[PDB]
mmCIF file of N, CA and C and ligand atoms in Angstrom:
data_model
loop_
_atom_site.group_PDB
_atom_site.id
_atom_site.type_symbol
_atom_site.label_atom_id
_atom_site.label_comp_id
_atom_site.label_asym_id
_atom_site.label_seq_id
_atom_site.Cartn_x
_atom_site.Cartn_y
_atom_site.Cartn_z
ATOM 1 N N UNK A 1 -2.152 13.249 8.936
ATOM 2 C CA UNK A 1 -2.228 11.888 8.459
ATOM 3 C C UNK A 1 -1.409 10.964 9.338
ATOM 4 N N UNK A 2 -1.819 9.684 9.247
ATOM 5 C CA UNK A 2 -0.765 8.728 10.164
ATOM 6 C C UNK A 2 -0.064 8.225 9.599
ATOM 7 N N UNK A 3 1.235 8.556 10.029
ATOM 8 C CA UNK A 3 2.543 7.624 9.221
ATOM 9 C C UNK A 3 2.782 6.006 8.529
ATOM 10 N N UNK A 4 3.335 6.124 7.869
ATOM 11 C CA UNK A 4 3.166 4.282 7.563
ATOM 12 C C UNK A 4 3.399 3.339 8.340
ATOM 13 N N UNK A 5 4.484 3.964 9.223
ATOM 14 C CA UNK A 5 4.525 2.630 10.278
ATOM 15 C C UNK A 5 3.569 2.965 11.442
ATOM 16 N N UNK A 6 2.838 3.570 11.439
ATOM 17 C CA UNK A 6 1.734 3.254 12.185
ATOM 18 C C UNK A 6 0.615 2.472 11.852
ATOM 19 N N UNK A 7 -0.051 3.145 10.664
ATOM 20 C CA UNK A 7 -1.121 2.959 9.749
ATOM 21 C C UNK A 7 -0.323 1.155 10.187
ATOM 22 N N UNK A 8 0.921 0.216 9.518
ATOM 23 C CA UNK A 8 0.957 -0.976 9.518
ATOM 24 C C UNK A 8 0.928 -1.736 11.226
ATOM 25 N N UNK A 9 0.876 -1.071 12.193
ATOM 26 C CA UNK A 9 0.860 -1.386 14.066
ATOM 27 C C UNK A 9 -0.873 -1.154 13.541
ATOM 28 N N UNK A 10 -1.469 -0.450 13.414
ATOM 29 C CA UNK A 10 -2.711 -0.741 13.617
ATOM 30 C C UNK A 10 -3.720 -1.538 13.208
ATOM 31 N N UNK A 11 -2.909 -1.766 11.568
ATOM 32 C CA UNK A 11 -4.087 -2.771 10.644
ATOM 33 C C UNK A 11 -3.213 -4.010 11.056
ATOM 34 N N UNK A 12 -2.311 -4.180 11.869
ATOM 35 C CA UNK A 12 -1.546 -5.943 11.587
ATOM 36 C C UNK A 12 -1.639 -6.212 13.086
ATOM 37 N N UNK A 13 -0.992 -5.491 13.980
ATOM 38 C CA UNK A 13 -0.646 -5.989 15.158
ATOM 39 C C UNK A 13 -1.372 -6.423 16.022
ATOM 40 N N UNK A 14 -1.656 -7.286 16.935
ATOM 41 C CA UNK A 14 -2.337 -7.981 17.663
ATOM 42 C C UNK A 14 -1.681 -8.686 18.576
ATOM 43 N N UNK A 15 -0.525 -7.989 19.558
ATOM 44 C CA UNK A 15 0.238 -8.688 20.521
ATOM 45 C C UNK A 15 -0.479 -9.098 21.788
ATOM 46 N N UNK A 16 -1.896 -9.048 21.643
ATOM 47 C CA UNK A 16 -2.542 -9.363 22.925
ATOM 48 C C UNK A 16 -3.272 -10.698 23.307
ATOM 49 N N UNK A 17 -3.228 -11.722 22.233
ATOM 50 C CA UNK A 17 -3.351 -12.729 22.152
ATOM 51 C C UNK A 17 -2.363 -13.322 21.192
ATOM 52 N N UNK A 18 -2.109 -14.807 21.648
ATOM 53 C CA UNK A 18 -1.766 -15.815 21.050
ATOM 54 C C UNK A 18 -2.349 -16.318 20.094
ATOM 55 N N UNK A 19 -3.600 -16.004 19.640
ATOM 56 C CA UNK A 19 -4.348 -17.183 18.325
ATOM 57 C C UNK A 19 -5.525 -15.948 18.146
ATOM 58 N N UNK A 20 -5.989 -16.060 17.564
ATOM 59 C CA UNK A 20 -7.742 -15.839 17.135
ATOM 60 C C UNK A 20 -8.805 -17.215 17.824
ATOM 61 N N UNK A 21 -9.510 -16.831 19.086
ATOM 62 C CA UNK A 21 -10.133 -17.846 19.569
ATOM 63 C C UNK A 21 -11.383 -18.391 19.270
ATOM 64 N N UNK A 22 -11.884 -17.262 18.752
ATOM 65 C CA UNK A 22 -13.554 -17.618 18.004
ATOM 66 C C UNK A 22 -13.339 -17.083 16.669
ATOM 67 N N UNK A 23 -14.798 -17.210 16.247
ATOM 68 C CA UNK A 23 -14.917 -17.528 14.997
ATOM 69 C C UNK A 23 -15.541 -15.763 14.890
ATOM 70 N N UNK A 24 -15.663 -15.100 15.807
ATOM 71 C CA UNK A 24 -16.002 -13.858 15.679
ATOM 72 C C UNK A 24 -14.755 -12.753 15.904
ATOM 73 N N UNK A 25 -13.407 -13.612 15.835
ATOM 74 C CA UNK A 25 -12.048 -12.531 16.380
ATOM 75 C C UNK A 25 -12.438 -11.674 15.190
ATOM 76 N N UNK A 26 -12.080 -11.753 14.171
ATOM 77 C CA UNK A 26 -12.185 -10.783 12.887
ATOM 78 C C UNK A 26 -13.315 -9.570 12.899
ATOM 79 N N UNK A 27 -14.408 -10.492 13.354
ATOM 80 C CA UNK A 27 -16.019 -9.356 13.432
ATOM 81 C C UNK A 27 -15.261 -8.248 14.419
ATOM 82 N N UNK A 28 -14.959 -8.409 15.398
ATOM 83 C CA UNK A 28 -14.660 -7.463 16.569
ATOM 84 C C UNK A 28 -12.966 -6.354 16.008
ATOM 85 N N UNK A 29 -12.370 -7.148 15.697
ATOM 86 C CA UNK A 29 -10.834 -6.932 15.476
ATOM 87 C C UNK A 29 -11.082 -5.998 14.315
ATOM 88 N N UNK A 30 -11.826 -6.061 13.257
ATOM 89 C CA UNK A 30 -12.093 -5.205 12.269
ATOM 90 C C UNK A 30 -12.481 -3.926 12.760
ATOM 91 N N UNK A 31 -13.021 -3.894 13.655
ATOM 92 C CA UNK A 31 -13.985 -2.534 14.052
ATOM 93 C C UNK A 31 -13.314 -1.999 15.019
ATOM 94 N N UNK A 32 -13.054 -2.629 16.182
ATOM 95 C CA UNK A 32 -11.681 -1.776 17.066
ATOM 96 C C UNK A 32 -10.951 -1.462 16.574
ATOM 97 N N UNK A 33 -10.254 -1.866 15.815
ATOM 98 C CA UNK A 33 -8.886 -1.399 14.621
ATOM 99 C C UNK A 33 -9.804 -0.098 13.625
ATOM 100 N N UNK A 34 -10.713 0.451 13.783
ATOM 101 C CA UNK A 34 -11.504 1.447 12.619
ATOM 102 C C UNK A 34 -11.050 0.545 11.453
ATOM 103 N N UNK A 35 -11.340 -0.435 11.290
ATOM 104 C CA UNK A 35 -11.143 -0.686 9.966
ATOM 105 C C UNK A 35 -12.795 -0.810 8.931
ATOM 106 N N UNK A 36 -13.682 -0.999 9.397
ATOM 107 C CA UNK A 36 -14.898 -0.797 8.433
ATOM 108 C C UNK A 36 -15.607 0.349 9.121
ATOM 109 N N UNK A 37 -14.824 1.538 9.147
ATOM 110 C CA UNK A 37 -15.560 3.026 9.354
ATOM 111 C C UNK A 37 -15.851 3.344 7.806
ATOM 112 N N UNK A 38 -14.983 3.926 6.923
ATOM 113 C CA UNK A 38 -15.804 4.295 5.722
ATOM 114 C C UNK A 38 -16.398 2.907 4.575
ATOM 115 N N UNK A 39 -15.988 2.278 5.287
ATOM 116 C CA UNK A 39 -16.329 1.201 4.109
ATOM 117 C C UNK A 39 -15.686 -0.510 4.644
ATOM 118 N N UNK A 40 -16.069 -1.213 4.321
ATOM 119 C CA UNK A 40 -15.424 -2.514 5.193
ATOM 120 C C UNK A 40 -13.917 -2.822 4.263
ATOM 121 N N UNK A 41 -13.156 -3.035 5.155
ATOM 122 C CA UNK A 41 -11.911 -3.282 4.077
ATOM 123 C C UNK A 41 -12.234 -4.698 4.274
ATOM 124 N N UNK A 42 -11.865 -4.767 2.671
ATOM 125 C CA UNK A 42 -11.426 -6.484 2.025
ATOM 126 C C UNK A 42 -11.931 -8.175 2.789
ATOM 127 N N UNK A 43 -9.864 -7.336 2.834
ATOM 128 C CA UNK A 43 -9.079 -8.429 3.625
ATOM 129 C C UNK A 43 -8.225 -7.795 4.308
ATOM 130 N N UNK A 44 -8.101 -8.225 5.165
ATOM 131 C CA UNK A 44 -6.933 -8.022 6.359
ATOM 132 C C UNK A 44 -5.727 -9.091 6.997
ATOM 133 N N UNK A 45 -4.783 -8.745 7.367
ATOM 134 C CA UNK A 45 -3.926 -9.909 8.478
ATOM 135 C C UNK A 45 -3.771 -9.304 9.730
ATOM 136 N N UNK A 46 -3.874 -10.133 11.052
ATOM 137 C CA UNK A 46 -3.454 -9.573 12.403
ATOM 138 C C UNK A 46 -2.011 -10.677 12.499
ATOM 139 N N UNK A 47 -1.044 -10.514 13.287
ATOM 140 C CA UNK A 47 0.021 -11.054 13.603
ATOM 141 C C UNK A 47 -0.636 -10.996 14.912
ATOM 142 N N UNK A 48 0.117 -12.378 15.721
ATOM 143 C CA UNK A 48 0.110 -12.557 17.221
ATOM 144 C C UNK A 48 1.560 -12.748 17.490
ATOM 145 N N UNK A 49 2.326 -11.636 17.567
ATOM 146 C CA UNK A 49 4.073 -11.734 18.045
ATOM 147 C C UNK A 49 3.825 -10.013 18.541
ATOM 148 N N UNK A 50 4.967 -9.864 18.869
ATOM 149 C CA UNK A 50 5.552 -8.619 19.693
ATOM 150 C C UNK A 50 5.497 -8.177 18.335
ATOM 151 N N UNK A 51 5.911 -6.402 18.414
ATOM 152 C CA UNK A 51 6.123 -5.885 17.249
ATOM 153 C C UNK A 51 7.393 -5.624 17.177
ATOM 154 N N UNK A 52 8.305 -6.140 18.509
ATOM 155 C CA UNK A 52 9.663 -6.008 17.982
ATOM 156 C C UNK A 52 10.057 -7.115 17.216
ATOM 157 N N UNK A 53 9.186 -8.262 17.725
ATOM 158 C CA UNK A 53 9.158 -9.524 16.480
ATOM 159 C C UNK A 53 9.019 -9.492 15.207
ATOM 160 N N UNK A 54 8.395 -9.011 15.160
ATOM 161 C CA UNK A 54 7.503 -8.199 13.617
ATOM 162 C C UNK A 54 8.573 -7.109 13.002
ATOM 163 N N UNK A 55 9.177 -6.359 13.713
ATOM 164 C CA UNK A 55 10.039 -5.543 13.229
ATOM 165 C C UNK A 55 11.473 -6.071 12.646
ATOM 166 N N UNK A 56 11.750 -7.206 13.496
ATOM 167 C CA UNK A 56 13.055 -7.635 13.172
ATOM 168 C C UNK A 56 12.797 -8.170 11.695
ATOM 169 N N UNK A 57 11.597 -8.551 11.081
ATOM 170 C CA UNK A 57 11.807 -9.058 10.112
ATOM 171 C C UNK A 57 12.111 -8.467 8.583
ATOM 172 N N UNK A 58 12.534 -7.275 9.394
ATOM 173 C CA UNK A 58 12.861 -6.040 7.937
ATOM 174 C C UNK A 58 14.979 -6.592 8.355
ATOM 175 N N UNK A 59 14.895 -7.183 8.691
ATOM 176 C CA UNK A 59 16.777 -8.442 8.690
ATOM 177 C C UNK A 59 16.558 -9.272 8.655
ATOM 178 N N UNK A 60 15.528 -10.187 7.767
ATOM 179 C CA UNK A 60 15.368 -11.365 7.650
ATOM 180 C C UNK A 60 15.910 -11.501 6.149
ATOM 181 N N UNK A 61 15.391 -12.414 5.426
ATOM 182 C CA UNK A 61 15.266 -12.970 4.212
ATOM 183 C C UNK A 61 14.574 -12.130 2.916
ATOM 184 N N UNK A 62 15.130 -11.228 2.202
ATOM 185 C CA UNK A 62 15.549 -10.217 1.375
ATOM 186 C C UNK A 62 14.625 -11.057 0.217
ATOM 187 N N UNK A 63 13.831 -10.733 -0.141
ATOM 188 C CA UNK A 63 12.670 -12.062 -1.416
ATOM 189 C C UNK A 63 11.772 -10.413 -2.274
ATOM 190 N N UNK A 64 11.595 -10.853 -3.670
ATOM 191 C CA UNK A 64 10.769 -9.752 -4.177
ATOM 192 C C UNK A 64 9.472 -9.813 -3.545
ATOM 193 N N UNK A 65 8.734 -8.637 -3.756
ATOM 194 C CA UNK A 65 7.414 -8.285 -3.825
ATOM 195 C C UNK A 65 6.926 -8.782 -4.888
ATOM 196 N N UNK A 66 5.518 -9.105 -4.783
ATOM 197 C CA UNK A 66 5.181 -9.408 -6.481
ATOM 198 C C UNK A 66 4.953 -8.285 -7.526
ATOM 199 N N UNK A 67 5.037 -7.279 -7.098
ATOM 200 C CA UNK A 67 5.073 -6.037 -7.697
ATOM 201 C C UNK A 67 6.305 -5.297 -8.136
ATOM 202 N N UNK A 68 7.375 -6.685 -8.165
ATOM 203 C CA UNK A 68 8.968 -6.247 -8.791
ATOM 204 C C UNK A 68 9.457 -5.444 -7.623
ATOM 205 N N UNK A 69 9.140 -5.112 -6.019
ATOM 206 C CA UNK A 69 10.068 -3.960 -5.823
ATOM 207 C C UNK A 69 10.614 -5.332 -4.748
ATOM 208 N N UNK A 70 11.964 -5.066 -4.418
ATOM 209 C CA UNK A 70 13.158 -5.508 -3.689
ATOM 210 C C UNK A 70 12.951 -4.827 -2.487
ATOM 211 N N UNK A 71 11.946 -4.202 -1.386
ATOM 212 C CA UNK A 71 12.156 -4.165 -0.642
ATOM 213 C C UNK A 71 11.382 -4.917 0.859
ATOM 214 N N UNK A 72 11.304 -6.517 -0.055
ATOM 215 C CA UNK A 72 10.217 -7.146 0.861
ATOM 216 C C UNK A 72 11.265 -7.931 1.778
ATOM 217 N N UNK A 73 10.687 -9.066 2.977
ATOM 218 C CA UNK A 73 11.386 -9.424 3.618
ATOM 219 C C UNK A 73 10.558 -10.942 4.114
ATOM 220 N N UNK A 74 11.243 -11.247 3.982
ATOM 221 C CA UNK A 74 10.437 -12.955 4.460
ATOM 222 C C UNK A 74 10.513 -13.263 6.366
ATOM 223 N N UNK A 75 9.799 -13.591 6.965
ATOM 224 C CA UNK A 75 10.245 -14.343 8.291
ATOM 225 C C UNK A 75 11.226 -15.410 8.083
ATOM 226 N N UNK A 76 12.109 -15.546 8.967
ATOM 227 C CA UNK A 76 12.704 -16.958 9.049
ATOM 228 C C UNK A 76 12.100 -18.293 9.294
ATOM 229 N N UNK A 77 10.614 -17.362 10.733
ATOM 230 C CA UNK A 77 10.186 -18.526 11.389
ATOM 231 C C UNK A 77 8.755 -18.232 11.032
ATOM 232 N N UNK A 78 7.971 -19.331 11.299
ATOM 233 C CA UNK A 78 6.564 -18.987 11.005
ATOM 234 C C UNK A 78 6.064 -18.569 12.531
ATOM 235 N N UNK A 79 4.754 -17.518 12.265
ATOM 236 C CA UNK A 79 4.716 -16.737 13.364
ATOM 237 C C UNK A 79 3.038 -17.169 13.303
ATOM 238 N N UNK A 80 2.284 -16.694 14.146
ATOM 239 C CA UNK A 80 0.713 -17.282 14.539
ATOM 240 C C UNK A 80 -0.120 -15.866 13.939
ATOM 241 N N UNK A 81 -0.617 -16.353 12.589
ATOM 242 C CA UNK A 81 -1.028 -15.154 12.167
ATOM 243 C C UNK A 81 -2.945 -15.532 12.084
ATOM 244 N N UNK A 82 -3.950 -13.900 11.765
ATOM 245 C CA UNK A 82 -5.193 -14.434 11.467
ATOM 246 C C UNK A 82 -5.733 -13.655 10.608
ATOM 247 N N UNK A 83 -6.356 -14.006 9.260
ATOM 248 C CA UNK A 83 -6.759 -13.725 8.328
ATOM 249 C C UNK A 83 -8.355 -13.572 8.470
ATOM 250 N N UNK A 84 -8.274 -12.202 8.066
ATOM 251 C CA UNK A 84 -9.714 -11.659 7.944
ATOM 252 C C UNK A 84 -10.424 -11.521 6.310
ATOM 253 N N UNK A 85 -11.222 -11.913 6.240
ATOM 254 C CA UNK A 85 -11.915 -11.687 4.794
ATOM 255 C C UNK A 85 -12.819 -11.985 5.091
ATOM 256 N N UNK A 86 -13.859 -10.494 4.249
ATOM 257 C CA UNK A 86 -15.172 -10.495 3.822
ATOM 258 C C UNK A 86 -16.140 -11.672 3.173
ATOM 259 N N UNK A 87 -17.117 -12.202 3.733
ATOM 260 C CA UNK A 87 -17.913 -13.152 3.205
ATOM 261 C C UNK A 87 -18.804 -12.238 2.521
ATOM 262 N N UNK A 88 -19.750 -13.210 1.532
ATOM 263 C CA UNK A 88 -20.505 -12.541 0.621
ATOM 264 C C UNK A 88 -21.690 -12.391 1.348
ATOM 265 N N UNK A 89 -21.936 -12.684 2.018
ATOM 266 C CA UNK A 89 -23.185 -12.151 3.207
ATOM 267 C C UNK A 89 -22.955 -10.401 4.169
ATOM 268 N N UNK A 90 -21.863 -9.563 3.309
ATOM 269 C CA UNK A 90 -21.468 -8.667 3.886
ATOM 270 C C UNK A 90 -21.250 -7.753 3.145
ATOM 271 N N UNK A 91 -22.237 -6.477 4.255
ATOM 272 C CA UNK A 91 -22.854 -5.476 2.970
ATOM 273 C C UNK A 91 -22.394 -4.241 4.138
ATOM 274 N N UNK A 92 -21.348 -3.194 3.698
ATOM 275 C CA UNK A 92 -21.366 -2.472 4.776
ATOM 276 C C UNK A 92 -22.798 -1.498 5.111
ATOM 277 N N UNK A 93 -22.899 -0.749 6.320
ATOM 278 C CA UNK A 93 -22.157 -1.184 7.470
ATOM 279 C C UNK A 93 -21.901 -2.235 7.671
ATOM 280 N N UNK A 94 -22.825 -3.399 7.503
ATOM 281 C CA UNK A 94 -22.669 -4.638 8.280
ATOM 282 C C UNK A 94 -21.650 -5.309 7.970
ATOM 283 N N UNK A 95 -20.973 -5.361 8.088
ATOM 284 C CA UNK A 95 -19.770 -6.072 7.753
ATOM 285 C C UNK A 95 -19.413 -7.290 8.273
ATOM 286 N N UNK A 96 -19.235 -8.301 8.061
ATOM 287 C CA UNK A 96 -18.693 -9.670 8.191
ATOM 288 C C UNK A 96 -17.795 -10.213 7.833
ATOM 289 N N UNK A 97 -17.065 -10.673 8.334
ATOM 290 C CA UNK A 97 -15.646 -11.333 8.169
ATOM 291 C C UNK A 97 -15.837 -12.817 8.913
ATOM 292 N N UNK A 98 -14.870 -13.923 8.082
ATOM 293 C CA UNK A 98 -14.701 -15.169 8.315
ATOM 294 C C UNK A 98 -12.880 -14.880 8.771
ATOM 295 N N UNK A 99 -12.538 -16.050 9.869
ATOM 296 C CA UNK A 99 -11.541 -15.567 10.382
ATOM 297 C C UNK A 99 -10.821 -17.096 10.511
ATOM 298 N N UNK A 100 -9.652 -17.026 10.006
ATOM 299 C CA UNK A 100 -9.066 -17.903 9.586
ATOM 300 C C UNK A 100 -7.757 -17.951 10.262
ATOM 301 N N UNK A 101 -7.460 -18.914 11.748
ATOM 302 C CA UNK A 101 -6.123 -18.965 12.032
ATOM 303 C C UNK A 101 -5.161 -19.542 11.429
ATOM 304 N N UNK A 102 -3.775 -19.284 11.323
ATOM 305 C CA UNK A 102 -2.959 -20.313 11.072
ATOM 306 C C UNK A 102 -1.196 -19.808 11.739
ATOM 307 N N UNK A 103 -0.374 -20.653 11.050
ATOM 308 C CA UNK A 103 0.716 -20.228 11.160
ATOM 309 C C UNK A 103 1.471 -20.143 10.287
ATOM 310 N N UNK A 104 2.127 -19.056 9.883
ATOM 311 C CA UNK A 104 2.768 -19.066 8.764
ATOM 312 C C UNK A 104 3.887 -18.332 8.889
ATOM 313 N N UNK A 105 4.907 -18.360 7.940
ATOM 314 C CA UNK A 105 5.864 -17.581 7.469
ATOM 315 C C UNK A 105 5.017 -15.880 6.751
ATOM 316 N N UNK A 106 5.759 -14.504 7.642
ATOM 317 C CA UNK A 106 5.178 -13.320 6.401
ATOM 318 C C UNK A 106 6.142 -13.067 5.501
ATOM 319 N N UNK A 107 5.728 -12.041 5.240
ATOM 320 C CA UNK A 107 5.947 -11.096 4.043
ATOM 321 C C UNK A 107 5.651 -9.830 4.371
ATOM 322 N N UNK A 108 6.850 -9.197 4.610
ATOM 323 C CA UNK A 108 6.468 -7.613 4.691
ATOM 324 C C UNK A 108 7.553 -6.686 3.700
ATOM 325 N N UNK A 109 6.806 -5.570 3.696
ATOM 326 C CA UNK A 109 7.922 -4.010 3.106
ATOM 327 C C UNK A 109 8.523 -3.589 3.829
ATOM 328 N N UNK A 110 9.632 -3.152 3.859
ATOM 329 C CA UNK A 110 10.118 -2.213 4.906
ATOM 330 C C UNK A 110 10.594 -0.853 4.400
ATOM 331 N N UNK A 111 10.807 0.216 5.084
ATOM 332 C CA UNK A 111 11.154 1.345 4.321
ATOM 333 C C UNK A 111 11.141 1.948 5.938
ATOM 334 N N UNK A 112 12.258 2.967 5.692
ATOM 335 C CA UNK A 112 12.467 4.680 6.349
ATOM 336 C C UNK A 112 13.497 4.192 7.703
ATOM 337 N N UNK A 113 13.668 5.290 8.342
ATOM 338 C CA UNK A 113 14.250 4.995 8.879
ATOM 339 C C UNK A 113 13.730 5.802 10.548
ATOM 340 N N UNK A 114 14.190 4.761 11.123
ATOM 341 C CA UNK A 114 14.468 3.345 11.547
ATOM 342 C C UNK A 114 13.488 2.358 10.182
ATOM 343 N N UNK A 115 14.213 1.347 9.756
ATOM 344 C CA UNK A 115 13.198 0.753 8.849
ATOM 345 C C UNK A 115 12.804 -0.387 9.616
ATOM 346 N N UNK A 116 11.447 -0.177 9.003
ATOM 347 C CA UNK A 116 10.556 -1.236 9.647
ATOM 348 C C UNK A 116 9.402 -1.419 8.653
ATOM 349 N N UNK A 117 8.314 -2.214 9.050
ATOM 350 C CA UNK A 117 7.418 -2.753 8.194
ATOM 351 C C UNK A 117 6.662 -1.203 8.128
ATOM 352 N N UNK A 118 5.918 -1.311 6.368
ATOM 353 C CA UNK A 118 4.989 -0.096 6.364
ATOM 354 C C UNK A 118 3.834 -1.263 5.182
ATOM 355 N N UNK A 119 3.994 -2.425 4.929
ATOM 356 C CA UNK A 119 3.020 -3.300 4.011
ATOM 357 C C UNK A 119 2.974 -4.346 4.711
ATOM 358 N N UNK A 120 1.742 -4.551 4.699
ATOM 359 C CA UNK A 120 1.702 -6.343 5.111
ATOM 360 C C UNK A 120 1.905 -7.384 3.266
ATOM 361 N N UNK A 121 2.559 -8.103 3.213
ATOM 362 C CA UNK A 121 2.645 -8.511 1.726
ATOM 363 C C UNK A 121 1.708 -9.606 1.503
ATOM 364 N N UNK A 122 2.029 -10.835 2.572
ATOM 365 C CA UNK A 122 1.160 -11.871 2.035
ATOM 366 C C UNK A 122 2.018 -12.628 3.199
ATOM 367 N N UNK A 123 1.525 -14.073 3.515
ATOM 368 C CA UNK A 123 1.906 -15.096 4.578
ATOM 369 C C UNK A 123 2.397 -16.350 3.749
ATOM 370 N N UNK A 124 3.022 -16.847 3.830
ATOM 371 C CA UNK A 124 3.578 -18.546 3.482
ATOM 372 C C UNK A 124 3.863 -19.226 4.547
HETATM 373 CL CL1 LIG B 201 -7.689 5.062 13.969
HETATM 374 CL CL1 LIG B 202 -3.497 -7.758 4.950
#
């Protein structure tokens, strides 16, 4: 099986661009990432920062999960993130995603050690 902090480098990270440039980043980014092999997932987030960027934020800003657990972590700074979600025109295989840039503040879990992110939580 793949560890959690991998499993979270593969479904989040995206240090190879700066933004989501078309309106098809998500269509492509879903499927290189294996993410609609057995089934199309959801929703997704890619981050555009380093992952040591991404990592530092398990020493950021200490905030609950909405699921009561204390081990989430806020960014300080807002980082260039892109949101993937399924449109209703999407039936796997075929899968479709609308892809939504922005910038925001995350939200991650951290756990183990070395601790680092193993959840993507949500963006503000
Ligand atoms: Cl894989
Ligand atoms: Cl996500």
């Amino acid at each position: 099986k793949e560890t959690a902090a991998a499993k979270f480098e593969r479904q989040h990270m995206d240090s190879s661009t700066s933004a989501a440039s078309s309106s098809n980043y998500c269509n492509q980014m879903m499927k290189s990432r294996n993410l609609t092999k057995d089934r199309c997932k959801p929703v997704n987030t890619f981050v555009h920062e380093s992952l040591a960027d991404v990592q530092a934020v398990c020493s950021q800003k200490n905030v609950a999960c909405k699921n009561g657990q204390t081990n989430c972590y806020q960014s300080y700074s807002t980082m260039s993130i892109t949101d993937c979600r399924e449109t209703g025109s999407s039936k796997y295989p075929n899968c479709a995603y609308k892809t939504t840039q922005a910038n925001k503040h995350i939200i991650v879990a951290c756990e183990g050690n070395p601790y680092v992110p193993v959840h993507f939580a949500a963006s503000v």
